[PDB]
Design an enzyme around this catalytic site. Structure first.
Site, short mmCIF file in Angstrom:
data_model
loop_
_atom_site.label_atom_id
_atom_site.label_comp_id
_atom_site.label_asym_id
_atom_site.label_seq_id
_atom_site.Cartn_x
_atom_site.Cartn_y
_atom_site.Cartn_z
N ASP A 93 0.76 -1.25 0.00
CA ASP A 93 0.00 0.00 0.00
C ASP A 93 0.79 1.30 0.00
OD1 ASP A 93 -2.82 1.15 2.04
OD2 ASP A 93 -2.53 1.23 -0.09
N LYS B 115 1.68 4.89 -0.75
CA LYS B 115 0.98 6.13 -1.08
C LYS B 115 1.36 7.21 -0.08
CE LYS B 115 -3.43 4.72 1.08
NZ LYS B 115 -4.87 4.63 0.87
N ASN C 71 0.35 7.07 3.64
CA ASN C 71 0.95 5.98 4.40
C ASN C 71 2.40 6.19 4.82
OD1 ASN C 71 -0.91 3.14 3.03
ND2 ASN C 71 -1.60 4.98 4.00
N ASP D 88 1.24 1.84 8.10
CA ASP D 88 0.21 1.09 7.39
C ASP D 88 0.65 -0.22 6.76
OD1 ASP D 88 -0.95 4.12 7.06
OD2 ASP D 88 -2.55 2.66 7.01
N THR E 182 -4.66 0.49 -2.99
CA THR E 182 -5.46 1.67 -3.27
C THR E 182 -5.54 1.88 -4.79
OG1 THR E 182 -4.67 2.50 -1.21
CG2 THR E 182 -5.62 4.17 -2.63
O1 LIG Z 1 -0.43 4.81 10.74
C1 LIG Z 1 -0.63 5.92 11.27
N1 LIG Z 1 -1.72 6.63 10.95
C2 LIG Z 1 -2.31 6.54 9.62
C3 LIG Z 1 -1.61 7.18 8.43
N2 LIG Z 1 -2.05 6.57 7.19
C4 LIG Z 1 -3.29 7.19 6.72
C5 LIG Z 1 -4.49 6.34 7.13
C6 LIG Z 1 -4.76 6.48 8.63
C7 LIG Z 1 -3.64 5.81 9.42
O2 LIG Z 1 -3.81 4.48 9.93
C8 LIG Z 1 -5.12 4.25 10.44
O3 LIG Z 1 -5.69 5.13 11.12
C9 LIG Z 1 -5.76 3.04 10.19
C10 LIG Z 1 -5.43 2.29 9.05
C11 LIG Z 1 -6.08 1.06 8.81
C12 LIG Z 1 -7.05 0.59 9.70
C13 LIG Z 1 -7.71 -0.62 9.49
O4 LIG Z 1 -8.85 -0.77 9.95
C14 LIG Z 1 -7.15 -1.68 8.76
C15 LIG Z 1 -7.79 -2.11 7.60
C16 LIG Z 1 -7.26 -3.17 6.85
C17 LIG Z 1 -6.08 -3.79 7.27
C18 LIG Z 1 -5.43 -3.36 8.43
C19 LIG Z 1 -5.96 -2.31 9.18
O5 LIG Z 1 -5.32 -1.90 10.28
C20 LIG Z 1 -7.36 1.35 10.84
C21 LIG Z 1 -6.72 2.56 11.09
C22 LIG Z 1 0.29 6.42 12.18
C23 LIG Z 1 1.21 5.55 12.80
C24 LIG Z 1 2.13 6.06 13.72
C25 LIG Z 1 2.14 7.43 14.02
O6 LIG Z 1 3.02 7.91 14.90
C26 LIG Z 1 1.23 8.28 13.41
C27 LIG Z 1 0.30 7.78 12.49
#
Ligand SMILES: O=C(NC1CNCCCC1OC(=O)c1ccc(C(=O)c2ccccc2O)cc1)c1ccc(O)cc1
Ligand SMILES: CCCCCCCC
Length: 339
Positions: free
Chosen positions: A155, A157, A160, A173, A190
């Protein structure tokens, strides 16, 4: 190439030691104070929390166990934690703690106050080719490491990737990341970053990440992705065609690297040829790149995020603050026995 071979050899043995015997249940939720939501996803959210005894700031990813089961992606959330727990590289976000309770799964990562690359790319419009190259060099090395470990990060992008205090990348991510020797078949990732293989429902490998890098580099240098449209169906037609248009401001070296990264035939794509990652490291667009200095983080970053103390949330945007609901009864304890 000995310095890289012995390096990658110590890296797979360090990884497998962690991969074969994972850490479970290293913290509890009531040892942390909740501060602010930093992001959301399909089954949960990431939240800035503060460890009560040490006073340290952490990013806690909270995933709802029943929402995962409902839309069968149990394997994906199990993949995410086991891989994160097992890796170690300067451009990957570090998993400090993990645990689960009656309702949720929790992954407590390092708090990277600089925010997502998406925010800064959008604010600036587009990055210069030196600035984009700085970031791209880091992704190249991060994937060289991850692909050595039979991992595909599916993933890549701007959302991420996080920018830290030194201006370097911290890849996060790992939700779609998977350990596989050979091919895999899951339709995930994506829309505008998906390689032709995935769209055409083929058994794909690590080459998918090198296509994604082409798209990432095009987006960093242009401000927009190479394949765009209103509906996903129209994005996919544009990807499967062997056609891509380049802005005039792109250098000839960049256009040539991108044609070989955005090669629709996976047997001809850079990073997936006989010479491997070196077809990219030796490409003329990376001629000025000092790969060991990028790894050792000795290169001056073209951007430092503006923020105050380590726990500042200015670079992350605002989301609705909802309750962390933990049920009095254990839900789906059997399906998440390995977490
Ligand atoms: O990963 C971080 N945040 C992000 C930055 N990327 C943009 C998307 C939102 C997000 O991660 C999530 O909030 C998020 C992502 C996926 C899932 C999720 O449900 C999911 C779905 C499919 C497979 C695995 C999953 O965890 C839940 C929350 C992050 C990590 C560390 C940090 O210090 C600050 C931010
Ligand atoms: C992925 C590089 C080779 C691994 C050798 C054993 C550790």
């Amino acid at each position: 190439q000995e310095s890289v071979k012995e390096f990658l050899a110590k890296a797979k043995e360090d990884f497998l030691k962690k991969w074969e015997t994972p850490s479970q249940n290293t913290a509890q939720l009531d040892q942390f104070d909740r501060i602010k939501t930093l992001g959301t996803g399909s089954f949960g959210r990431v939240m800035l929390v503060k460890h009560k005894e040490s006073g340290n700031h952490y990013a806690m990813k909270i995933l709802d166990k029943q929402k995962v089961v409902k839309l069968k992606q149990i394997e994906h959330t199990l993949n995410e934690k086991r891989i994160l727990q097992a890796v170690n590289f300067p451009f990957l976000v570090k998993l400090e703690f993990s645990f689960k309770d009656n309702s949720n799964l929790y992954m407590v990562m390092e708090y990277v106050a600089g925010g997502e690359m998406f925010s800064h790319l959008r604010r600036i419009g587009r990055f210069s080719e030196p600035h984009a190259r700085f970031y791209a060099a880091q992704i190249v090395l991060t994937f060289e490491y991850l692909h050595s470990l039979d991992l595909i990060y599916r993933d890549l992008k701007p959302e991420n990737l996080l920018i830290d205090q030194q201006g370097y990348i911290q890849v996060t991510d790992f939700g779609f990341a998977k350990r596989v020797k050979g091919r895999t078949w899951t339709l995930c990732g994506t829309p505008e970053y998906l390689a032709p293989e995935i769209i055409l429902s083929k058994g794909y490998n690590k080459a998918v990440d090198w296509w994604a890098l082409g798209v990432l580099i095009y987006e960093m240098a242009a401000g927009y992705p190479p394949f765009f449209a209103d509906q996903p169906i129209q994005i996919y037609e544009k990807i499967v065609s062997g056609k891509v248009r380049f802005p005039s401001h792109f250098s000839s070296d960049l256009k040539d690297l991108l044609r070989n990264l955005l090669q629709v035939d996976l047997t001809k794509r850079f990073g997936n040829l006989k010479n491997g990652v070196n077809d990219i490291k030796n490409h003329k667009w990376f001629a000025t790149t000092d790969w060991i200095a990028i790894y050792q983080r000795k290169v001056e970053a073209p951007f430092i995020p503006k923020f105050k103390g380590p726990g500042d949330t200015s670079n992350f945007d605002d989301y609705e603050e909802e309750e962390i609901r933990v049920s009095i009864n254990e839900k789906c304890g059997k399906e998440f026995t390995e977490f």
